[PDB]
Design a protein around this ligand. Sequence first.
Ligand SMILES: [Zn+2]
Length: 258
Amino acid sequence: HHWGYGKHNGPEHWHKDFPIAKGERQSPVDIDTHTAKYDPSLKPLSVSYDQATSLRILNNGHAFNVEFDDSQDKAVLKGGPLDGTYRLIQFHFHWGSLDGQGSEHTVDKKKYAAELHLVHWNTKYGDFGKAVQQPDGLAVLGIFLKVGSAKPGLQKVVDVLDSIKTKGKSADFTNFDPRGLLPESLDYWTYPGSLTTPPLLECVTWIVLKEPISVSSEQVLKFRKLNFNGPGEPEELMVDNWRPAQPLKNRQIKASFK
Ligand SMILES: [Zn+2]
């Protein structure tokens, strides 16, 4: 009876195994755009993905992760609210059972169809495992997905999902360029938060882009064909793998833009 997104093991249950679920800097949150304060001391985001090396795509039973070689400074996030350099280790998505829900962060209570998380760790802590134990260990770039025109740079991901239907299944996934998943603008909101899955560690600087990307209905429909379950188990569709907004408590969301 391990955590998930079902009736009996979903987000409202997680605190029993992970008491930090009720902590002081939990994610996601609702972004109240009118209360977010423009911070002119914030710097432009620096996304340097030209040398990114993807390796694998994995169904881990709660999402699929596109994994990168993070043994060198190849794909890095810096600037913005960040001090130092953060290395890309994986990205994944959260999505809904239909287009009206799926995102984790909300914007003035608006839910998007899905949300992309590009996960980076602070190089001053040596690796990901040590980074998640630090309050400034991770930087996660969050990008909203709405349904409309297709995202061409997403299609290579969509087309491999048939090969990782069930949890624990992986597939080779080299030469994928995550620049193809970015919107035009890098305007963002930022706040201190947590992992949105157990262990829910409070180690993340969140950077949420204001501009969503558009993906096609066909593209998100293929996300929804994945399975939470393992091979030869009863089929449960991997849908609604999002945590709802958590209390903001003593935090301020800052905007990079007016
Ligand atoms: Zn996530």
